PDB file of N, CA and C in Angstrom:
ATOM      1  N   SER U   9      87.458  79.958 110.485  1.00  0.00           N
ATOM      2  CA  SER U   9      86.124  80.438 110.012  1.00  0.00           C
ATOM      3  C   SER U   9      86.198  81.504 108.910  1.00  0.00           C
ATOM      4  N   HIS U  10      85.563  81.213 107.771  1.00  0.00           N
ATOM      5  CA  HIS U  10      85.249  82.236 106.774  1.00  0.00           C
ATOM      6  C   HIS U  10      83.946  82.894 107.205  1.00  0.00           C
ATOM      7  N   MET U  11      84.025  84.194 107.415  1.00  0.00           N
ATOM      8  CA  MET U  11      82.907  84.962 107.936  1.00  0.00           C
ATOM      9  C   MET U  11      82.818  86.285 107.200  1.00  0.00           C
ATOM     10  N   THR U  12      81.591  86.790 107.079  1.00  0.00           N
ATOM     11  CA  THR U  12      81.354  88.164 106.658  1.00  0.00           C
ATOM     12  C   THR U  12      80.585  88.905 107.741  1.00  0.00           C
ATOM     13  N   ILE U  13      80.942  90.165 107.929  1.00  0.00           N
ATOM     14  CA  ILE U  13      80.232  91.045 108.858  1.00  0.00           C
ATOM     15  C   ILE U  13      80.040  92.309 108.060  1.00  0.00           C
ATOM     16  N   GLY U  14      78.858  92.433 107.469  1.00  0.00           N
ATOM     17  CA  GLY U  14      78.600  93.503 106.472  1.00  0.00           C
ATOM     18  C   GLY U  14      79.664  93.487 105.384  1.00  0.00           C
ATOM     19  N   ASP U  15      80.339  94.623 105.173  1.00  0.00           N
ATOM     20  CA  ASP U  15      81.398  94.716 104.126  1.00  0.00           C
ATOM     21  C   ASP U  15      82.760  94.102 104.513  1.00  0.00           C
ATOM     22  N   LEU U  16      82.880  93.614 105.743  1.00  0.00           N
ATOM     23  CA  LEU U  16      84.118  92.962 106.171  1.00  0.00           C
ATOM     24  C   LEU U  16      84.055  91.465 105.934  1.00  0.00           C
ATOM     25  N   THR U  17      85.165  90.928 105.449  1.00  0.00           N
ATOM     26  CA  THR U  17      85.293  89.501 105.243  1.00  0.00           C
ATOM     27  C   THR U  17      86.534  89.019 105.980  1.00  0.00           C
ATOM     28  N   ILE U  18      86.334  88.062 106.871  1.00  0.00           N
ATOM     29  CA  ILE U  18      87.440  87.382 107.558  1.00  0.00           C
ATOM     30  C   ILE U  18      87.692  86.029 106.860  1.00  0.00           C
ATOM     31  N   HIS U  19      88.948  85.807 106.490  1.00  0.00           N
ATOM     32  CA  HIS U  19      89.388  84.500 105.996  1.00  0.00           C
ATOM     33  C   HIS U  19      90.339  83.921 107.059  1.00  0.00           C
ATOM     34  N   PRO U  20      90.508  82.588 107.093  1.00  0.00           N
ATOM     35  CA  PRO U  20      91.394  82.084 108.142  1.00  0.00           C
ATOM     36  C   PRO U  20      92.893  82.102 107.773  1.00  0.00           C
ATOM     37  N   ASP U  21      93.216  82.413 106.513  1.00  0.00           N
ATOM     38  CA  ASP U  21      94.589  82.244 106.000  1.00  0.00           C
ATOM     39  C   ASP U  21      95.650  83.194 106.576  1.00  0.00           C
ATOM     40  N   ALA U  22      95.255  84.425 106.917  1.00  0.00           N
ATOM     41  CA  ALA U  22      96.232  85.484 107.187  1.00  0.00           C
ATOM     42  C   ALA U  22      95.759  86.467 108.248  1.00  0.00           C
ATOM     43  N   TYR U  23      96.702  87.222 108.798  1.00  0.00           N
ATOM     44  CA  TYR U  23      96.383  88.277 109.749  1.00  0.00           C
ATOM     45  C   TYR U  23      96.000  89.507 108.929  1.00  0.00           C
ATOM     46  N   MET U  24      94.726  89.523 108.548  1.00  0.00           N
ATOM     47  CA  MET U  24      94.158  90.569 107.707  1.00  0.00           C
ATOM     48  C   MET U  24      92.625  90.534 107.743  1.00  0.00           C
ATOM     49  N   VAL U  25      92.027  91.599 107.228  1.00  0.00           N
ATOM     50  CA  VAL U  25      90.608  91.628 106.940  1.00  0.00           C
ATOM     51  C   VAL U  25      90.455  92.231 105.532  1.00  0.00           C
ATOM     52  N   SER U  26      89.409  91.803 104.845  1.00  0.00           N
ATOM     53  CA  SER U  26      89.065  92.347 103.540  1.00  0.00           C
ATOM     54  C   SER U  26      87.802  93.209 103.653  1.00  0.00           C
ATOM     55  N   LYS U  27      87.792  94.305 102.903  1.00  0.00           N
ATOM     56  CA  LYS U  27      86.701  95.273 102.906  1.00  0.00           C
ATOM     57  C   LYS U  27      86.505  95.778 101.485  1.00  0.00           C
ATOM     58  N   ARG U  28      85.401  95.347 100.879  1.00  0.00           N
ATOM     59  CA  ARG U  28      85.053  95.772  99.515  1.00  0.00           C
ATOM     60  C   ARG U  28      86.206  95.615  98.523  1.00  0.00           C
ATOM     61  N   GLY U  29      86.871  94.457  98.567  1.00  0.00           N
ATOM     62  CA  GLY U  29      87.946  94.147  97.638  1.00  0.00           C
ATOM     63  C   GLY U  29      89.348  94.611  98.005  1.00  0.00           C
ATOM     64  N   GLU U  30      89.452  95.318  99.123  1.00  0.00           N
ATOM     65  CA  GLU U  30      90.718  95.777  99.659  1.00  0.00           C
ATOM     66  C   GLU U  30      91.151  94.859 100.791  1.00  0.00           C
ATOM     67  N   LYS U  31      92.411  94.411 100.770  1.00  0.00           N
ATOM     68  CA  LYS U  31      92.967  93.651 101.903  1.00  0.00           C
ATOM     69  C   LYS U  31      93.780  94.550 102.813  1.00  0.00           C
ATOM     70  N   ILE U  32      93.521  94.433 104.106  1.00  0.00           N
ATOM     71  CA  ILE U  32      94.105  95.303 105.102  1.00  0.00           C
ATOM     72  C   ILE U  32      94.847  94.433 106.117  1.00  0.00           C
ATOM     73  N   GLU U  33      96.155  94.630 106.185  1.00  0.00           N
ATOM     74  CA  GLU U  33      96.965  93.901 107.148  1.00  0.00           C
ATOM     75  C   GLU U  33      96.661  94.290 108.590  1.00  0.00           C
ATOM     76  N   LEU U  34      96.585  93.268 109.430  1.00  0.00           N
ATOM     77  CA  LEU U  34      96.430  93.460 110.874  1.00  0.00           C
ATOM     78  C   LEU U  34      97.601  92.844 111.616  1.00  0.00           C
ATOM     79  N   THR U  35      97.977  93.431 112.749  1.00  0.00           N
ATOM     80  CA  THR U  35      98.902  92.762 113.653  1.00  0.00           C
ATOM     81  C   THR U  35      98.254  91.486 114.251  1.00  0.00           C
ATOM     82  N   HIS U  36      99.064  90.658 114.911  1.00  0.00           N
ATOM     83  CA  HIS U  36      98.543  89.467 115.582  1.00  0.00           C
ATOM     84  C   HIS U  36      97.434  89.835 116.560  1.00  0.00           C
ATOM     85  N   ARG U  37      97.689  90.814 117.432  1.00  0.00           N
ATOM     86  CA  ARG U  37      96.695  91.257 118.422  1.00  0.00           C
ATOM     87  C   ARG U  37      95.436  91.865 117.785  1.00  0.00           C
ATOM     88  N   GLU U  38      95.624  92.688 116.759  1.00  0.00           N
ATOM     89  CA  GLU U  38      94.487  93.336 116.087  1.00  0.00           C
ATOM     90  C   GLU U  38      93.566  92.253 115.525  1.00  0.00           C
ATOM     91  N   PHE U  39      94.170  91.273 114.857  1.00  0.00           N
ATOM     92  CA  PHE U  39      93.432  90.163 114.272  1.00  0.00           C
ATOM     93  C   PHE U  39      92.718  89.318 115.331  1.00  0.00           C
ATOM     94  N   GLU U  40      93.447  88.936 116.370  1.00  0.00           N
ATOM     95  CA  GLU U  40      92.889  88.124 117.459  1.00  0.00           C
ATOM     96  C   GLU U  40      91.697  88.823 118.124  1.00  0.00           C
ATOM     97  N   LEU U  41      91.824  90.127 118.354  1.00  0.00           N
ATOM     98  CA  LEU U  41      90.758  90.935 118.938  1.00  0.00           C
ATOM     99  C   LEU U  41      89.546  90.954 117.994  1.00  0.00           C
ATOM    100  N   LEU U  42      89.789  91.290 116.723  1.00  0.00           N
ATOM    101  CA  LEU U  42      88.705  91.372 115.724  1.00  0.00           C
ATOM    102  C   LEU U  42      87.981  90.040 115.578  1.00  0.00           C
ATOM    103  N   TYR U  43      88.765  88.964 115.447  1.00  0.00           N
ATOM    104  CA  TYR U  43      88.207  87.638 115.295  1.00  0.00           C
ATOM    105  C   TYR U  43      87.403  87.239 116.536  1.00  0.00           C
ATOM    106  N   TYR U  44      87.951  87.528 117.722  1.00  0.00           N
ATOM    107  CA  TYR U  44      87.253  87.254 118.947  1.00  0.00           C
ATOM    108  C   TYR U  44      85.926  88.002 119.014  1.00  0.00           C
ATOM    109  N   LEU U  45      85.923  89.285 118.673  1.00  0.00           N
ATOM    110  CA  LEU U  45      84.675  90.056 118.659  1.00  0.00           C
ATOM    111  C   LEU U  45      83.689  89.521 117.593  1.00  0.00           C
ATOM    112  N   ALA U  46      84.213  89.152 116.434  1.00  0.00           N
ATOM    113  CA  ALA U  46      83.418  88.458 115.391  1.00  0.00           C
ATOM    114  C   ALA U  46      82.743  87.172 115.894  1.00  0.00           C
ATOM    115  N   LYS U  47      83.465  86.349 116.661  1.00  0.00           N
ATOM    116  CA  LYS U  47      82.865  85.120 117.257  1.00  0.00           C
ATOM    117  C   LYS U  47      81.730  85.448 118.208  1.00  0.00           C
ATOM    118  N   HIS U  48      81.836  86.611 118.834  1.00  0.00           N
ATOM    119  CA  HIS U  48      80.896  87.081 119.818  1.00  0.00           C
ATOM    120  C   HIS U  48      80.164  88.284 119.273  1.00  0.00           C
ATOM    121  N   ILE U  49      79.802  88.193 117.988  1.00  0.00           N
ATOM    122  CA  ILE U  49      79.149  89.285 117.268  1.00  0.00           C
ATOM    123  C   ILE U  49      77.957  89.841 118.059  1.00  0.00           C
ATOM    124  N   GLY U  50      77.882  91.167 118.139  1.00  0.00           N
ATOM    125  CA  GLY U  50      76.882  91.888 118.920  1.00  0.00           C
ATOM    126  C   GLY U  50      76.853  91.668 120.427  1.00  0.00           C
ATOM    127  N   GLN U  51      77.829  90.928 120.962  1.00  0.00           N
ATOM    128  CA  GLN U  51      77.993  90.758 122.420  1.00  0.00           C
ATOM    129  C   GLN U  51      78.988  91.804 122.929  1.00  0.00           C
ATOM    130  N   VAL U  52      78.602  92.544 123.969  1.00  0.00           N
ATOM    131  CA  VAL U  52      79.508  93.530 124.571  1.00  0.00           C
ATOM    132  C   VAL U  52      80.552  92.806 125.408  1.00  0.00           C
ATOM    133  N   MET U  53      81.829  93.077 125.122  1.00  0.00           N
ATOM    134  CA  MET U  53      82.940  92.494 125.847  1.00  0.00           C
ATOM    135  C   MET U  53      83.661  93.568 126.637  1.00  0.00           C
ATOM    136  N   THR U  54      83.779  93.359 127.948  1.00  0.00           N
ATOM    137  CA  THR U  54      84.528  94.291 128.800  1.00  0.00           C
ATOM    138  C   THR U  54      86.031  94.254 128.465  1.00  0.00           C
ATOM    139  N   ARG U  55      86.735  95.331 128.805  1.00  0.00           N
ATOM    140  CA  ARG U  55      88.178  95.418 128.568  1.00  0.00           C
ATOM    141  C   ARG U  55      88.956  94.363 129.349  1.00  0.00           C
ATOM    142  N   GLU U  56      88.539  94.092 130.582  1.00  0.00           N
ATOM    143  CA  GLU U  56      89.185  93.043 131.369  1.00  0.00           C
ATOM    144  C   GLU U  56      88.995  91.657 130.731  1.00  0.00           C
ATOM    145  N   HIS U  57      87.795  91.383 130.217  1.00  0.00           N
ATOM    146  CA  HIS U  57      87.542  90.096 129.538  1.00  0.00           C
ATOM    147  C   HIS U  57      88.409  89.966 128.280  1.00  0.00           C
ATOM    148  N   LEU U  58      88.496  91.051 127.508  1.00  0.00           N
ATOM    149  CA  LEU U  58      89.331  91.103 126.300  1.00  0.00           C
ATOM    150  C   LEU U  58      90.823  90.924 126.622  1.00  0.00           C
ATOM    151  N   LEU U  59      91.288  91.637 127.654  1.00  0.00           N
ATOM    152  CA  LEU U  59      92.640  91.463 128.172  1.00  0.00           C
ATOM    153  C   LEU U  59      92.953  90.021 128.520  1.00  0.00           C
ATOM    154  N   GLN U  60      92.128  89.400 129.368  1.00  0.00           N
ATOM    155  CA  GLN U  60      92.328  87.983 129.725  1.00  0.00           C
ATOM    156  C   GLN U  60      92.312  86.999 128.546  1.00  0.00           C
ATOM    157  N   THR U  61      91.412  87.220 127.599  1.00  0.00           N
ATOM    158  CA  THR U  61      91.239  86.289 126.480  1.00  0.00           C
ATOM    159  C   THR U  61      92.260  86.461 125.348  1.00  0.00           C
ATOM    160  N   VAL U  62      92.508  87.707 124.966  1.00  0.00           N
ATOM    161  CA  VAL U  62      93.357  88.039 123.795  1.00  0.00           C
ATOM    162  C   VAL U  62      94.811  88.237 124.210  1.00  0.00           C
ATOM    163  N   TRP U  63      95.027  88.732 125.423  1.00  0.00           N
ATOM    164  CA  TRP U  63      96.393  88.982 125.887  1.00  0.00           C
ATOM    165  C   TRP U  63      97.218  87.910 126.663  1.00  0.00           C
ATOM    166  N   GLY U  64      97.009  87.460 127.910  1.00  0.00           N
ATOM    167  CA  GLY U  64      95.859  87.459 128.759  1.00  0.00           C
ATOM    168  C   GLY U  64      96.257  87.713 130.222  1.00  0.00           C
ATOM    169  N   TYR U  65      96.493  86.672 131.045  1.00  0.00           N
ATOM    170  CA  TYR U  65      96.542  86.827 132.530  1.00  0.00           C
ATOM    171  C   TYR U  65      97.421  87.964 133.092  1.00  0.00           C
ATOM    172  N   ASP U  66      98.650  88.077 132.587  1.00  0.00           N
ATOM    173  CA  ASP U  66      99.605  89.098 133.048  1.00  0.00           C
ATOM    174  C   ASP U  66      99.203  90.514 132.634  1.00  0.00           C
ATOM    175  N   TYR U  67      98.190  90.646 131.772  1.00  0.00           N
ATOM    176  CA  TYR U  67      97.807  91.963 131.209  1.00  0.00           C
ATOM    177  C   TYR U  67      96.588  92.592 131.910  1.00  0.00           C
ATOM    178  N   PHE U  68      96.042  91.887 132.901  1.00  0.00           N
ATOM    179  CA  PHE U  68      94.873  92.372 133.644  1.00  0.00           C
ATOM    180  C   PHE U  68      95.133  93.788 134.176  1.00  0.00           C
ATOM    181  N   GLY U  69      94.182  94.695 133.993  1.00  0.00           N
ATOM    182  CA  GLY U  69      94.357  96.077 134.430  1.00  0.00           C
ATOM    183  C   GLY U  69      95.027  96.990 133.402  1.00  0.00           C
ATOM    184  N   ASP U  70      95.559  96.423 132.317  1.00  0.00           N
ATOM    185  CA  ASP U  70      96.178  97.228 131.228  1.00  0.00           C
ATOM    186  C   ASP U  70      95.074  97.668 130.242  1.00  0.00           C
ATOM    187  N   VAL U  71      94.006  98.278 130.761  1.00  0.00           N
ATOM    188  CA  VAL U  71      92.804  98.581 129.927  1.00  0.00           C
ATOM    189  C   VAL U  71      93.102  99.474 128.734  1.00  0.00           C
ATOM    190  N   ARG U  72      94.089 100.352 128.901  1.00  0.00           N
ATOM    191  CA  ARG U  72      94.578 101.198 127.815  1.00  0.00           C
ATOM    192  C   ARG U  72      95.031 100.403 126.605  1.00  0.00           C
ATOM    193  N   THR U  73      95.663  99.252 126.847  1.00  0.00           N
ATOM    194  CA  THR U  73      96.111  98.351 125.767  1.00  0.00           C
ATOM    195  C   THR U  73      94.940  97.961 124.844  1.00  0.00           C
ATOM    196  N   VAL U  74      93.792  97.617 125.434  1.00  0.00           N
ATOM    197  CA  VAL U  74      92.569  97.334 124.652  1.00  0.00           C
ATOM    198  C   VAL U  74      92.137  98.571 123.872  1.00  0.00           C
ATOM    199  N   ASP U  75      91.995  99.692 124.565  1.00  0.00           N
ATOM    200  CA  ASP U  75      91.552 100.949 123.941  1.00  0.00           C
ATOM    201  C   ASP U  75      92.433 101.357 122.750  1.00  0.00           C
ATOM    202  N   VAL U  76      93.749 101.229 122.906  1.00  0.00           N
ATOM    203  CA  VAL U  76      94.642 101.612 121.812  1.00  0.00           C
ATOM    204  C   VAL U  76      94.516 100.644 120.629  1.00  0.00           C
ATOM    205  N   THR U  77      94.350  99.354 120.939  1.00  0.00           N
ATOM    206  CA  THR U  77      94.188  98.331 119.912  1.00  0.00           C
ATOM    207  C   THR U  77      92.860  98.514 119.180  1.00  0.00           C
ATOM    208  N   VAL U  78      91.790  98.813 119.933  1.00  0.00           N
ATOM    209  CA  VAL U  78      90.487  99.163 119.329  1.00  0.00           C
ATOM    210  C   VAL U  78      90.648 100.356 118.368  1.00  0.00           C
ATOM    211  N   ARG U  79      91.298 101.408 118.847  1.00  0.00           N
ATOM    212  CA  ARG U  79      91.569 102.600 118.034  1.00  0.00           C
ATOM    213  C   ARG U  79      92.319 102.295 116.719  1.00  0.00           C
ATOM    214  N   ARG U  80      93.386 101.509 116.838  1.00  0.00           N
ATOM    215  CA  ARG U  80      94.139 101.045 115.660  1.00  0.00           C
ATOM    216  C   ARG U  80      93.277 100.225 114.702  1.00  0.00           C
ATOM    217  N   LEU U  81      92.469  99.314 115.260  1.00  0.00           N
ATOM    218  CA  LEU U  81      91.555  98.502 114.455  1.00  0.00           C
ATOM    219  C   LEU U  81      90.592  99.372 113.698  1.00  0.00           C
ATOM    220  N   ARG U  82      90.031 100.356 114.394  1.00  0.00           N
ATOM    221  CA  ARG U  82      89.112 101.317 113.794  1.00  0.00           C
ATOM    222  C   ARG U  82      89.768 102.116 112.678  1.00  0.00           C
ATOM    223  N   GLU U  83      91.005 102.567 112.912  1.00  0.00           N
ATOM    224  CA  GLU U  83      91.794 103.320 111.926  1.00  0.00           C
ATOM    225  C   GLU U  83      92.005 102.494 110.661  1.00  0.00           C
ATOM    226  N   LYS U  84      92.129 101.184 110.831  1.00  0.00           N
ATOM    227  CA  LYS U  84      92.282 100.272 109.701  1.00  0.00           C
ATOM    228  C   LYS U  84      90.954  99.853 109.041  1.00  0.00           C
ATOM    229  N   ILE U  85      89.909  99.606 109.823  1.00  0.00           N
ATOM    230  CA  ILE U  85      88.704  98.955 109.275  1.00  0.00           C
ATOM    231  C   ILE U  85      87.489  99.857 109.063  1.00  0.00           C
ATOM    232  N   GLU U  86      87.454 101.015 109.730  1.00  0.00           N
ATOM    233  CA  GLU U  86      86.282 101.880 109.640  1.00  0.00           C
ATOM    234  C   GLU U  86      86.392 102.885 108.488  1.00  0.00           C
ATOM    235  N   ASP U  87      85.268 103.062 107.795  1.00  0.00           N
ATOM    236  CA  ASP U  87      85.067 104.119 106.802  1.00  0.00           C
ATOM    237  C   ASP U  87      85.476 105.483 107.352  1.00  0.00           C
ATOM    238  N   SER U  88      84.918 105.835 108.510  1.00  0.00           N
ATOM    239  CA  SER U  88      85.400 106.973 109.273  1.00  0.00           C
ATOM    240  C   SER U  88      85.640 106.530 110.722  1.00  0.00           C
ATOM    241  N   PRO U  89      86.923 106.340 111.089  1.00  0.00           N
ATOM    242  CA  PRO U  89      87.369 105.873 112.412  1.00  0.00           C
ATOM    243  C   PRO U  89      86.819 106.694 113.581  1.00  0.00           C
ATOM    244  N   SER U  90      86.614 107.996 113.369  1.00  0.00           N
ATOM    245  CA  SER U  90      86.082 108.865 114.423  1.00  0.00           C
ATOM    246  C   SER U  90      84.575 108.679 114.620  1.00  0.00           C
ATOM    247  N   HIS U  91      83.916 108.036 113.657  1.00  0.00           N
ATOM    248  CA  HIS U  91      82.504 107.680 113.804  1.00  0.00           C
ATOM    249  C   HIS U  91      82.269 106.187 113.492  1.00  0.00           C
ATOM    250  N   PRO U  92      82.772 105.294 114.363  1.00  0.00           N
ATOM    251  CA  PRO U  92      82.762 103.860 114.047  1.00  0.00           C
ATOM    252  C   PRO U  92      81.350 103.282 113.924  1.00  0.00           C
ATOM    253  N   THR U  93      81.179 102.314 113.020  1.00  0.00           N
ATOM    254  CA  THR U  93      79.887 101.645 112.880  1.00  0.00           C
ATOM    255  C   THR U  93      79.996 100.116 112.960  1.00  0.00           C
ATOM    256  N   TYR U  94      81.206  99.572 112.796  1.00  0.00           N
ATOM    257  CA  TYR U  94      81.465  98.139 112.957  1.00  0.00           C
ATOM    258  C   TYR U  94      81.871  97.829 114.384  1.00  0.00           C
ATOM    259  N   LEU U  95      82.899  98.532 114.858  1.00  0.00           N
ATOM    260  CA  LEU U  95      83.481  98.241 116.171  1.00  0.00           C
ATOM    261  C   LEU U  95      83.080  99.359 117.105  1.00  0.00           C
ATOM    262  N   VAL U  96      82.078  99.089 117.925  1.00  0.00           N
ATOM    263  CA  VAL U  96      81.326 100.134 118.603  1.00  0.00           C
ATOM    264  C   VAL U  96      81.517  99.997 120.110  1.00  0.00           C
ATOM    265  N   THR U  97      81.542 101.145 120.768  1.00  0.00           N
ATOM    266  CA  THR U  97      81.691 101.237 122.199  1.00  0.00           C
ATOM    267  C   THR U  97      80.325 101.294 122.850  1.00  0.00           C
ATOM    268  N   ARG U  98      80.059 100.355 123.755  1.00  0.00           N
ATOM    269  CA  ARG U  98      78.963 100.500 124.720  1.00  0.00           C
ATOM    270  C   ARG U  98      79.534 101.259 125.909  1.00  0.00           C
ATOM    271  N   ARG U  99      79.205 102.557 125.984  1.00  0.00           N
ATOM    272  CA  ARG U  99      79.871 103.468 126.919  1.00  0.00           C
ATOM    273  C   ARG U  99      79.884 102.933 128.348  1.00  0.00           C
ATOM    274  N   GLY U 100      81.079 102.914 128.933  1.00  0.00           N
ATOM    275  CA  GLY U 100      81.331 102.429 130.283  1.00  0.00           C
ATOM    276  C   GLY U 100      81.287 100.925 130.496  1.00  0.00           C
ATOM    277  N   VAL U 101      81.052 100.157 129.434  1.00  0.00           N
ATOM    278  CA  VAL U 101      80.869  98.716 129.591  1.00  0.00           C
ATOM    279  C   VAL U 101      81.924  97.911 128.820  1.00  0.00           C
ATOM    280  N   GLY U 102      82.012  98.137 127.511  1.00  0.00           N
ATOM    281  CA  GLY U 102      83.054  97.501 126.703  1.00  0.00           C
ATOM    282  C   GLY U 102      82.829  97.739 125.225  1.00  0.00           C
ATOM    283  N   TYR U 103      83.245  96.769 124.419  1.00  0.00           N
ATOM    284  CA  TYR U 103      83.223  96.907 122.975  1.00  0.00           C
ATOM    285  C   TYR U 103      82.493  95.748 122.339  1.00  0.00           C
ATOM    286  N   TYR U 104      81.904  96.000 121.172  1.00  0.00           N
ATOM    287  CA  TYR U 104      81.338  94.897 120.392  1.00  0.00           C
ATOM    288  C   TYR U 104      81.511  95.142 118.907  1.00  0.00           C
ATOM    289  N   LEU U 105      81.472  94.043 118.165  1.00  0.00           N
ATOM    290  CA  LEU U 105      81.411  94.137 116.721  1.00  0.00           C
ATOM    291  C   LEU U 105      79.966  93.937 116.272  1.00  0.00           C
ATOM    292  N   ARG U 106      79.553  94.693 115.262  1.00  0.00           N
ATOM    293  CA  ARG U 106      78.221  94.565 114.703  1.00  0.00           C
ATOM    294  C   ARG U 106      78.298  94.729 113.198  1.00  0.00           C
ATOM    295  N   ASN U 107      77.254  94.246 112.536  1.00  0.00           N
ATOM    296  CA  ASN U 107      77.007  94.509 111.134  1.00  0.00           C
ATOM    297  C   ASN U 107      76.087  95.745 111.058  1.00  0.00           C
ATOM    298  N   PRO U 108      76.644  96.884 110.602  1.00  0.00           N
ATOM    299  CA  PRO U 108      75.865  98.104 110.526  1.00  0.00           C
ATOM    300  C   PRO U 108      74.991  98.195 109.263  1.00  0.00           C
ATOM    301  N   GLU U 109      75.120  97.253 108.326  1.00  0.00           N
ATOM    302  CA  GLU U 109      74.441  97.364 107.016  1.00  0.00           C
ATOM    303  C   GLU U 109      73.081  96.699 107.051  1.00  0.00           C
TER     304      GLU U 109
END
């Protein structure tokens, strides 16, 4: 899928995302997580659901793994990672991707 989510552009060719003409390399997991959240745009995904889908079965309960990967994704894709607007936390529930523009 070629997709845009505000200033982010996903192409299917590579483990990366593009943002306003800049290409940003992602790890396999970072990409899989981002793409998965993109498919489920604006849907809140719990950490256990993300673990099972992106990781999966043997990783159940490794919720920190999701949190650290989210943090890394934010560090790569957000204008200001400490104030995310694309990859947002629904407190106590999970994570979602949105178009903030």
